[PDB]
Amino acid sequence: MKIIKLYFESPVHFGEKRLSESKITFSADTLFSALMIEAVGLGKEDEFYQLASNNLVKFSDAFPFIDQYYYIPKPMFNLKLAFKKLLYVPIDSLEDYLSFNLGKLALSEKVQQHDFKDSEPYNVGTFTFKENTGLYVLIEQTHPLLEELLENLQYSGIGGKRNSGYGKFKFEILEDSDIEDLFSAKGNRKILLSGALPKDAELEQALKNASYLLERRGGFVQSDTYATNLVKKQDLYVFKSGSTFENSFDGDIYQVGKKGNHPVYKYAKSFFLEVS
Amino acid sequence: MDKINLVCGSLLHNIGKIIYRGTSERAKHSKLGGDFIKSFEQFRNTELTDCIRYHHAQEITSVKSNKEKNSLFYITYIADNISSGMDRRKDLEEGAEGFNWDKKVALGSVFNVLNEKEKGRQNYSYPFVAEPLNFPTATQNQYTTSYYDGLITDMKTILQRLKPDKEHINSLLQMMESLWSYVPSSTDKNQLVDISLYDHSRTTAAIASAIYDYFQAENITDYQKELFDYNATEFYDKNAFLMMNFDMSGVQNFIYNISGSKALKSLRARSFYLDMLLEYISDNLLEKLELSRANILYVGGGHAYLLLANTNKTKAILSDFEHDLKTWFLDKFKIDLYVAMAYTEVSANDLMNHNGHYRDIYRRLSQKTSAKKANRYTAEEILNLNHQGTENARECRECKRSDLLIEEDDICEICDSLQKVSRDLTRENIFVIANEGVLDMPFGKKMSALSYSQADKLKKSNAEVQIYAKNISEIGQNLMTRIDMGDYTYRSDFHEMLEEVEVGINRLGVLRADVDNLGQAFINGIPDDYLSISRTATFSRAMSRFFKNYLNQLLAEKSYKINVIYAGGDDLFMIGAWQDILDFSIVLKQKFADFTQNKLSISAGIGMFREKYPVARMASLTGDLEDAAKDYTKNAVTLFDATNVFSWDTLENDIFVKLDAITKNFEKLDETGKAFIYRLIDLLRGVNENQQINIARLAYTLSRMEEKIGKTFAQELYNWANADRKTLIMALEIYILKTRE
Amino acid sequence: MKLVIEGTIVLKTGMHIGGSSDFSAIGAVASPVVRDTLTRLPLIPGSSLKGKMRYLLAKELNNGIDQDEILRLFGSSEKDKIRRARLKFNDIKLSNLAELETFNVSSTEVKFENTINRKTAVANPRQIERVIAGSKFDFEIFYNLDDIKEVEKDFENIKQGFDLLEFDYLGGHGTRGSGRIAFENLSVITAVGNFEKINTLNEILGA
């Protein structure tokens, strides 16, 4: 199981509800949406969907990482038992569990001027990473196709505010074996690592002793082909990445657009870190 | 035989003792209670009379067979026992003619016991001034019987407008919080003089109704054998109390779920709306529990702790209330708002605090609340919540939400209702709920929030209609209950507000404050030895009471050009002229220190912006400023920037004595300011990087203008610019900002 | 398949870009220049360069009387027609701080300025922070080579916009003598795919 490390040399804007604020990381269907839009840039979008639909391409979402420390969101248990301010724990320090600051959020103030009229300002929330940090994306069984797409994505930009002028990155794989054995392990409680949602006939079996938050996950369709306007998406509600489940489930790539000239998918497949 | 008699025997209790401590009748107080009975509307049945004149143990054993069973004063006896926190087994109770009871002693302050293991045991009391503006102090106090007979004449000339029945408990409770807020619970016994007897009566009413419904469900007989043929422990070793709670999560992201134009109005709208939703949700639960409002311990910002009975019928109605409230939030606020109702069971011995075990009752309730918070929605709720998704070409701009949008305009129905109702909202305005209103509330009854206008005529025959009030005057058929919300507004136009100022720079100053270390102080603040439940109720209710009424009165007594957006312990946001904001921050800090006996800290952040500046970016910037203040991890304040963080005494003392000295000195000088002050600030901010040569230039300029600015002021500036430097830069900056024409 | 338009921006005058909401002290600089929030190195935001090129290119075409060329270069969100933006700008950071350290001067300055009321004849001073002249700015702009038959007109338009921006300011108070830039060391390189006639793109732009 491989690593995908993302080094940003420019600020990022990962919006979650509005342009004025931003988020440290980006989700999994955000990266999958970027890969779909770039694959239909290359025309190979159909067999990329047939790869990601049949589990050979299965990635988690982005996580913070500092120099030789890979992080995850604080897994949230039914713990009966200060470190309550900390949002991220190192990925190998879960056994110890049972200082940290990457970057700083900034707000960039912009304007749009009209020539024979008064101007109008708008402001963009940004995030800038420190010099020896960034984000990393977990992936198992790397494919030549996704190695080609991320090689091609880095000149289009992950992030929100494009193409002015923020999201750009250079990636490298840099596989690791100190944390592959964590994912080869098996335990009794399995934490989630991506924004996921089980299929309708297994949500009950997935929902037994869980600890989760829903997140709304919608927005606008970003294409020049979906139905001659800016149509919103069917707001899918997926589990938060810092969830825990005692029993596993497998997600689906749900179609959240069913009215334009092409389908709009949303990645909601599961990715577990099994722990005792 | 219903609980009106018992709740009146609890709430109307110990009036005979508070008149016993001032009026000379040295006989047994049972005859005083019985003689006080018949001087009302009519004398009641024997139930309430025996409830209020039999709670003395020898008289209890003296009256067995001359009257019937179903005592209904055994309840109030062990109710006073459990609400007291200690035992009265066979001893003579208070004022029982057993010793020379010389009762002239005032009410002790709540904050003396608070955190006595870190800073020792202080002691204070509550003085009396003939709401309103008063503050507890460390001097001995005394009450006089003339004011007592005056207040009882007022109480009995306005009291007869109510009927001793079910619905009038609210109105007598409103007059009880008007009157009994400062009268003590007892005279001696320091373990009892810490709390006022008004909340002791509220607690006694709650626990009396709880044990009454407990015995109504368990269907038991012979209360005399059960409770007195053994010494009242066999009740205590049974589970009979359900102390449940409420917890709205994510209130902050719904208050600040605004990005539109009208962001001033929507902020106060949402901050009022969450509180009023919690109010009606709690009151409707008590209404469906056929219960009075005395069972509320505390309602705050997002939290509502309760005390009910432990019966299976209450469990069934609690689960039904769960399902209805959860479905109603999932209809309106998709995942945004969520209440976490969890009940915890305690035995009657368990809250007597003899074996301890009270802070872990709060801890267990927190564990169950977090457990329900971890697993929020069930399977079909998530399935329905994903299936109701649809795509549209419109959204609202605050609530970025693609359903329940109005026609011809693109703002969501709550998202516009909040703006409109925030527009028509003043001080003396009344809040009303019915089946027709504006703002959505469960279970299908809305809120109108209409003023004194052509729609006042609903209060005639206002069946199934409730009234939420700011002021209370009429206690006949009005029935207005108080909701604590603070909405001081000077002018409501920022341009007129600034235009009235003609002394300083034309800027708009912004205060954001919050109480730091409020969390563990609210959860576990009162120490385990002298630990009470009504003390915590008074603590939190007094905190919210302080912020609301003393904030409006402190801003009313001096004409401060400050618009309050919303107040509270957790949150405070005021926009006004910067002169009044700076001059009021020290006032608010010192009045909070006087109210809390300076052991609850407070931090704040002052920001300063121009006349026409957006309120959303204003609030975010000043919130950043006060976060930098609280990061220091003690009490402090930031003046206009994160680089200028000062402690409150440091700001007050150092900056304001330096500012007042500078203002005295440069006024009498005929031609010195302000060019000398700008050169002085230039040197005193260049000295941060080039430390030596600017100190030399400073000495050169001060002896240069020794003959001009003053002999002693120049050497004072030279002394201050080496000892406490960074203070004097801010003192000079706010001096010029004050004196710019 | 994708191209990289790389050059340098050399300042001939000030170029004060941007306004933060940072609080200004009373005797100090109001309206500071935009910077990196973490390096505190002066910066040209890519939205500023993009907006100024769009302004000059849109004012150039349709002379005194928008068009498919401008929308296909810099995007569109019109209700009827939506086109993906071919150009991809980046925030330009300062590059020659090694050279400006050699000259023993900071990369930023304060310009002192006032207005004078014409009736009351009282001055009204202001300080504006401003990048110094002689600064360099390595910029990368990425082009989406989605159509081959239009790349010649596209790169002609890009060089036209660069030349129009050579005779006009880049950001801030340019009418009072600021913001004058020049583009030197312009080159085009591909990163993925392979464009055959990359040389005519290099010659239409680096001429």
Side-chain angles (χ1 to χ4, degrees), chain A residues 1-80 82-276, chain B residues 1-9 11-17 19-175 177-260 262-426 428-482 484-585 587-741, chain C residues 1-64 66-180 182-188 190-207:
Chain A
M1 174 178 318
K2 303 290 96 175
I3 302 299
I4 289 191
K5 294 224 276 174
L6 301 177
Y7 310 105
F8 292 96
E9 66 263 20
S10 62
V12 304
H13 167 78
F14 299 126
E16 65 96 22
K17 189 180 194 95
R18 65 188 76 257
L19 189 73
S20 88
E21 61 86 20
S22 174
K23 190 170 41 169
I24 297 169
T25 74
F26 61 96
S27 179
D29 49 358
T30 313
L31 185 137
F32 182 70
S33 300
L35 290 181
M36 294 299 291
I37 193 66
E38 176 83 325
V40 61
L42 286 172
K44 298 175 74 69
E45 79 284 15
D46 199 4
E47 61 86 20
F48 184 62
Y49 176 66
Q50 295 298 109
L51 275 171
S53 312
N54 198 78
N55 293 317
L56 272 297
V57 174
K58 190 184 295 303
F59 44 83
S60 79
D61 58 25
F63 301 117
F65 88 101
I66 298 89
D67 268 357
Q68 69 274 16
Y69 293 102
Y70 289 68
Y71 284 67
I72 62 170
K74 175 183 64 153
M76 65 182 179
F77 298 101
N78 197 1
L79 196 61
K80 317 295 284 190
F83 287 170
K84 273 81 173 177
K85 60 182 172 64
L86 190 64
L87 267 297
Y88 295 95
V89 64
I91 191 168
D92 61 346
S93 300
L94 277 296
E95 297 294 327
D96 291 331
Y97 197 72
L98 277 160
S99 180
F100 158 72
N101 215 340
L102 78 165
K104 67 182 290 294
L105 277 80
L107 187 148
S108 170
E109 293 179 353
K110 300 195 181 305
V111 69
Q112 171 203 2
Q113 64 84 30
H114 318 88
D115 216 319
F116 305 129
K117 209 209 295 182
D118 48 354
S119 298
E120 53 184 359
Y122 72 102
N123 61 5
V124 176
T126 69
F127 181 71
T128 300
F129 295 87
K130 275 165 188 174
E131 182 65 26
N132 296 115
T133 184
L135 299 175
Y136 80 99
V137 185
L138 294 174
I139 190 167
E140 62 186 3
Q141 296 294 321
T142 175
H143 211 260
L145 186 63
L146 189 144
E147 195 194 9
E148 193 274 333
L149 282 167
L150 269 173
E151 185 68 27
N152 193 0
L153 180 55
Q154 42 174 18
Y155 299 104
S156 291
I158 185 54
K161 193 53 177 167
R162 298 303 336 190
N163 297 115
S164 305
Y166 287 152
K168 96 188 287 295
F169 68 103
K170 319 193 85 142
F171 85 109
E172 68 177 338
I173 299 302
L174 188 153
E175 62 93 20
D176 203 302
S177 71
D178 192 286
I179 62 170
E180 184 178 1
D181 59 341
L182 288 170
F183 286 109
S184 74
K186 64 90 176 179
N188 63 339
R189 192 153 263 288
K190 315 181 168 79
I191 70 169
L192 201 49
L193 286 174
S194 76
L197 177 78
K199 296 181 176 69
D200 294 336
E202 57 193 357
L203 192 152
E204 179 65 27
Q205 188 274 331
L207 184 62
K208 176 60 67 185
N209 297 317
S211 315
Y212 64 95
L213 282 71
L214 277 296
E215 268 167 7
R216 66 181 294 276
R217 183 65 60 84
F220 278 69
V221 181
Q222 184 191 323
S223 66
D224 62 358
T225 317
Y226 194 99
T228 186
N229 272 318
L230 306 160
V231 181
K232 287 207 81 199
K233 281 196 278 288
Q234 198 159 303
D235 47 351
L236 183 63
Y237 285 78
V238 298
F239 289 138
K240 177 150 181 133
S241 43
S243 299
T244 61
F245 293 91
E246 62 87 19
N247 48 6
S248 165
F249 61 95
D250 293 353
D252 195 1
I253 297 169
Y254 300 71
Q255 171 177 349
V256 297
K258 49 189 86 167
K259 292 183 188 296
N261 282 6
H262 66 87
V264 171
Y265 296 132
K266 189 156 283 301
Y267 192 84
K269 294 183 114 150
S270 54
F271 196 90
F272 291 111
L273 187 147
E274 293 179 353
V275 68
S276 72
Chain B
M1 185 180 288
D2 198 74
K3 64 210 291 180
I4 297 89
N5 306 291
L6 181 58
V7 72
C8 276
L11 280 170
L12 281 74
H13 204 265
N14 285 314
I15 62 171
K17 184 260 290 180
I19 199 63
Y20 187 88
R21 72 208 184 100
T23 314
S24 304
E25 282 88 1
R26 296 295 87 193
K28 184 73 73 173
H29 84 290
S30 181
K31 180 262 289 181
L32 189 152
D35 286 335
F36 197 78
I37 282 166
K38 271 73 186 157
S39 289
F40 282 117
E41 176 205 10
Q42 286 98 17
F43 53 94
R44 290 90 159 174
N45 283 313
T46 181
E47 212 81 8
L48 188 153
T49 68
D50 297 332
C51 180
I52 64 187
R53 80 189 198 244
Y54 290 166
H55 48 274
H56 187 218
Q58 278 71 10
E59 276 81 3
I60 301 299
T61 49
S62 184
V63 176
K64 299 288 94 175
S65 175
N66 50 358
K67 280 196 173 58
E68 293 179 353
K69 285 183 182 179
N70 314 125
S71 159
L72 273 298
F73 47 86
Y74 293 163
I75 301 299
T76 316
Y77 163 73
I78 53 170
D80 193 1
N81 284 126
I82 187 66
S83 184
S84 50
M86 72 292 292
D87 206 347
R88 326 177 193 275
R89 284 293 155 217
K90 260 79 178 168
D91 70 291
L92 301 153
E93 70 183 359
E94 66 274 16
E97 191 183 1
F99 206 76
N100 316 314
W101 272 117
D102 196 1
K103 293 187 286 185
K104 297 293 291 296
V105 183
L107 179 61
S109 173
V110 188
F111 307 109
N112 52 49
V113 71
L114 185 65
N115 298 113
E116 65 93 20
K117 297 297 296 194
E118 293 83 3
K119 46 182 283 194
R121 185 62 162 81
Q122 281 88 16
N123 50 1
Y124 307 103
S125 172
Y126 286 110
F128 190 77
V129 181
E131 197 190 7
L133 190 75
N134 63 6
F135 289 112
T137 178
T139 45
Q140 312 295 333
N141 291 313
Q142 188 269 330
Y143 296 82
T144 50
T145 315
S146 70
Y147 305 146
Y148 278 75
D149 60 65
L151 192 148
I152 296 169
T153 46
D154 286 14
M155 170 180 165
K156 282 230 280 187
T157 195
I158 211 163
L159 177 56
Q160 303 303 131
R161 297 185 69 186
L162 278 77
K163 305 287 101 175
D165 209 321
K166 178 61 155 173
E167 69 93 16
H168 299 91
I169 301 299
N170 305 290
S171 188
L172 65 87
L173 183 63
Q174 295 141 23
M175 294 298 102
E177 66 183 1
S178 74
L179 294 174
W180 291 23
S181 65
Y182 270 122
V183 58
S185 294
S186 194
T187 298
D188 278 10
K189 310 303 191 312
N190 175 258
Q191 53 261 9
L192 270 77
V193 298
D194 209 356
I195 60 170
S196 176
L197 190 151
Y198 161 66
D199 289 330
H200 203 265
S201 61
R202 277 170 83 191
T203 294
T204 318
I207 62 171
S209 299
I211 183 181
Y212 185 12
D213 288 274
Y214 187 80
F215 268 32
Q216 280 282 104
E218 296 292 328
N219 317 316
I220 206 164
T221 301
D222 55 274
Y223 321 122
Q224 63 84 30
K225 197 260 165 196
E226 168 263 332
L227 205 65
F228 275 127
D229 265 354
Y230 207 79
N231 278 315
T233 63
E234 310 205 43
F235 160 67
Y236 271 62
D237 49 49
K238 308 264 273 195
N239 281 306
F241 290 79
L242 278 180
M243 184 177 177
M244 61 80 71
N245 76 310
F246 287 82
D247 189 358
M248 294 183 286
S249 185
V251 289
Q252 285 85 5
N253 303 133
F254 184 76
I255 295 154
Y256 297 101
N257 199 0
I258 61 170
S259 284
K262 300 179 182 294
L264 194 86
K265 289 205 279 278
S266 306
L267 210 56
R268 71 168 71 96
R270 285 146 182 279
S271 188
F272 167 69
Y273 182 47
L274 276 296
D275 291 331
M276 185 63 73
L277 293 174
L278 186 60
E279 283 311 284
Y280 188 39
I281 277 166
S282 45
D283 291 331
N284 206 280
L285 173 70
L286 277 297
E287 196 150 49
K288 284 176 77 169
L289 213 66
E290 55 84 27
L291 204 48
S292 83
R293 288 204 77 256
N295 307 69
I296 297 285
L297 282 72
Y298 170 59
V299 296
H303 297 89
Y305 287 75
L306 277 73
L307 182 62
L308 323 174
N310 199 324
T311 66
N312 273 40
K313 194 171 80 70
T314 49
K315 307 308 293 305
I317 199 67
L318 200 73
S319 175
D320 208 312
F321 190 91
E322 181 66 26
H323 176 246
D324 291 331
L325 200 56
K326 187 194 283 283
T327 287
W328 193 87
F329 290 168
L330 283 160
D331 279 332
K332 290 294 180 185
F333 319 100
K334 299 285 192 175
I335 65 151
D336 301 2
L337 276 299
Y338 188 50
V339 287
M341 293 182 285
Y343 63 92
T344 182
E345 57 185 6
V346 287
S347 177
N349 210 359
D350 204 4
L351 75 164
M352 183 179 72
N353 213 18
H354 188 255
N355 46 3
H357 294 88
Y358 179 56
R359 288 173 161 206
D360 63 358
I361 312 305
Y362 274 11
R363 278 188 33 74
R364 189 187 301 112
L365 183 62
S366 71
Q367 295 297 109
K368 280 198 86 68
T369 300
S370 161
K372 201 156 275 291
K373 270 178 143 52
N375 183 4
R376 286 186 182 181
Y377 320 112
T378 81
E380 61 283 17
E381 314 285 286
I382 294 168
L383 286 163
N384 201 24
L385 185 149
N386 271 308
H387 196 286
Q388 296 264 32
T390 186
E391 65 191 83
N392 297 114
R394 292 196 300 117
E395 68 192 291
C396 175
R397 67 184 77 99
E398 293 83 3
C399 54
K400 287 199 151 49
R401 214 177 82 91
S402 169
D403 50 342
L404 294 174
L405 277 155
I406 70 181
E407 210 58 65
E408 167 148 10
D409 185 74
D410 59 357
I411 297 89
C412 84
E413 60 86 20
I414 44 180
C415 300
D416 190 359
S417 288
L418 294 174
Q419 303 183 352
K420 175 170 274 288
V421 162
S422 179
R423 177 55 161 181
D424 52 6
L425 188 135
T426 69
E428 207 261 330
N429 266 4
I430 193 66
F431 307 111
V432 64
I433 53 172
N435 288 340
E436 190 276 331
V438 175
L439 276 70
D440 305 309
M441 293 180 183
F443 307 164
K445 298 172 173 61
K446 295 206 278 173
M447 153 157 66
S448 298
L450 60 87
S451 171
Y452 289 98
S453 85
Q454 56 268 11
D456 292 330
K457 280 73 176 175
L458 184 63
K459 79 183 188 292
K460 269 75 164 171
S461 175
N462 50 345
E464 212 179 4
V465 167
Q466 312 309 310
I467 301 299
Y468 280 106
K470 192 76 60 157
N471 313 134
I472 186 66
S473 307
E474 297 88 4
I475 55 160
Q477 302 299 310
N478 218 7
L479 275 296
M480 308 148 86
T481 179
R482 186 161 298 241
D484 292 331
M485 183 278 287
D487 195 58
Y488 186 58
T489 295
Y490 184 77
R491 191 62 62 86
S492 194
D493 311 338
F494 288 150
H495 186 46
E496 291 275 74
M497 185 180 288
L498 294 182
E499 180 80 27
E500 184 178 1
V501 171
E502 184 178 1
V503 63
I505 188 182
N506 194 11
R507 300 299 175 84
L508 202 65
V510 175
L511 167 58
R512 285 206 81 179
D514 53 354
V515 179
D516 49 343
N517 220 336
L518 189 64
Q520 67 211 33
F522 162 75
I523 292 158
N524 303 314
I526 297 89
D528 202 21
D529 213 351
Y530 292 139
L531 175 56
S532 300
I533 180 168
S534 192
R535 196 170 304 123
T536 163
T538 61
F539 182 76
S540 312
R541 201 281 182 201
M543 278 281 314
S544 78
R545 182 179 63 83
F546 160 70
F547 268 114
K548 299 293 183 182
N549 65 8
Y550 292 102
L551 191 147
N552 296 115
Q553 296 294 321
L554 276 163
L555 294 174
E557 55 93 21
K558 286 190 288 294
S559 290
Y560 275 131
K561 309 168 189 57
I562 289 168
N563 281 359
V564 182
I565 314 300
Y566 58 95
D570 186 23
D571 61 357
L572 179 63
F573 186 35
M574 290 138 53
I575 297 169
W578 81 269
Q579 290 261 47
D580 283 342
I581 286 280
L582 177 59
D583 280 9
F584 179 61
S585 81
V587 168
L588 188 153
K589 184 253 163 183
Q590 289 277 23
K591 290 294 166 199
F592 187 92
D594 291 331
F595 169 67
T596 61
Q597 316 287 132
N598 57 287
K599 48 171 56 168
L600 277 296
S601 302
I602 189 167
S603 63
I606 314 283
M608 182 178 72
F609 309 89
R610 59 202 159 96
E611 171 188 2
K612 293 182 181 180
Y613 204 61
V615 192
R617 192 57 197 145
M618 198 169 273
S620 66
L621 279 160
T622 313
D624 186 74
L625 259 54
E626 61 86 20
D627 291 331
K630 83 176 68 161
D631 291 331
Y632 175 57
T633 63
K634 304 286 101 175
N635 49 328
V637 63
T638 61
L639 277 297
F640 310 140
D641 196 4
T643 62
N644 302 132
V645 182
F646 302 115
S647 179
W648 268 122
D649 56 344
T650 290
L651 161 70
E652 200 275 331
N653 278 312
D654 301 334
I655 282 174
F656 281 174
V657 299
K658 283 179 182 173
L659 176 60
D660 206 4
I662 283 157
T663 318
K664 294 181 176 67
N665 279 278
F666 280 111
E667 169 59 41
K668 63 184 182 69
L669 294 174
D670 195 20
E671 59 272 13
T672 307
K674 301 184 289 293
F676 168 60
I677 296 92
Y678 278 67
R679 296 191 279 100
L680 184 56
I681 290 177
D682 186 74
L683 287 174
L684 281 165
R685 283 186 315 210
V687 67
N688 174 55
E689 183 178 1
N690 308 317
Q691 189 274 331
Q692 296 289 283
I693 195 61
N694 291 292
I695 281 289
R697 284 171 196 164
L698 181 60
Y700 174 74
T701 46
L702 283 169
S703 296
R704 183 176 176 87
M705 294 177 71
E706 173 86 13
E707 294 293 328
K708 193 156 271 291
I709 77 158
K711 297 296 289 183
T712 60
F713 184 47
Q715 216 274 335
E716 210 160 13
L717 290 173
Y718 188 65
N719 289 321
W720 285 346
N722 288 287
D724 198 29
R725 177 173 69 84
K726 190 168 68 67
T727 295
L728 188 153
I729 296 89
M730 184 63 72
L732 281 179
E733 293 179 353
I734 65 180
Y735 173 64
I736 311 154
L737 287 165
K738 283 197 193 206
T739 188
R740 175 183 305 190
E741 206 276 332
Chain C
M1 186 66 204
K2 281 189 187 297
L3 321 170
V4 176
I5 317 177
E6 172 142 8
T8 61
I9 288 172
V10 166
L11 273 67
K12 307 301 195 187
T13 59
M15 183 278 288
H16 156 79
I17 286 180
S20 72
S21 284
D22 291 331
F23 174 65
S24 50
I26 183 153
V29 182
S31 66
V33 71
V34 68
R35 286 196 179 91
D36 187 336
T37 187
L38 203 52
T39 301
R40 303 266 321 274
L41 200 79
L43 182 139
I44 291 170
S47 60
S48 290
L49 174 69
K50 175 170 165 214
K52 203 68 179 177
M53 293 177 70
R54 184 167 187 177
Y55 187 60
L56 295 169
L57 267 171
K59 217 166 86 168
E60 182 65 26
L61 298 150
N62 221 29
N63 282 103
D66 283 321
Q67 193 63 41
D68 189 314
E69 322 188 36
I70 304 300
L71 295 177
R72 98 194 170 194
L73 292 182
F74 308 101
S76 58
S77 87
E78 189 183 354
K79 291 174 70 175
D80 213 317
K81 59 190 77 170
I82 308 172
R83 200 172 296 107
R84 196 188 304 107
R86 282 177 179 169
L87 277 296
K88 158 97 172 55
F89 287 78
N90 295 299
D91 276 20
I92 315 164
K93 283 199 235 189
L94 185 139
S95 65
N96 66 327
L97 197 71
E99 184 181 343
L100 302 184
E101 182 65 26
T102 293
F103 281 61
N104 294 94
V105 57
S106 162
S107 66
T108 187
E109 61 152 359
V110 184
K111 195 196 189 229
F112 288 88
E113 183 66 26
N114 51 69
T115 183
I116 297 169
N117 196 6
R118 296 180 178 162
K119 177 169 75 69
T120 61
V122 173
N124 191 27
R126 55 171 179 281
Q127 312 178 28
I128 53 170
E129 202 172 5
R130 199 180 73 175
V131 189
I132 63 170
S135 296
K136 272 81 178 177
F137 273 100
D138 265 347
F139 67 98
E140 296 180 354
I141 298 171
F142 304 149
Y143 181 87
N144 201 336
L145 188 82
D146 62 358
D147 183 65
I148 300 97
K149 280 73 176 175
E150 286 189 353
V151 67
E152 295 294 328
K153 191 63 65 68
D154 288 329
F155 265 47
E156 191 172 14
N157 285 17
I158 294 169
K159 179 52 165 58
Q160 186 87 42
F162 279 162
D163 291 331
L164 284 156
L165 189 43
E166 203 200 338
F167 285 99
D168 192 305
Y169 52 95
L170 184 50
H173 322 295
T175 313
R176 281 85 55 81
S178 166
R180 188 184 168 184
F183 288 82
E184 67 157 30
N185 198 359
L186 294 178
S187 67
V188 176
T190 187
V192 296
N194 184 29
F195 191 46
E196 275 84 5
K197 43 161 50 171
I198 188 173
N199 305 343
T200 178
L201 285 196
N202 206 321
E203 291 297 322
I204 193 66
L205 187 145

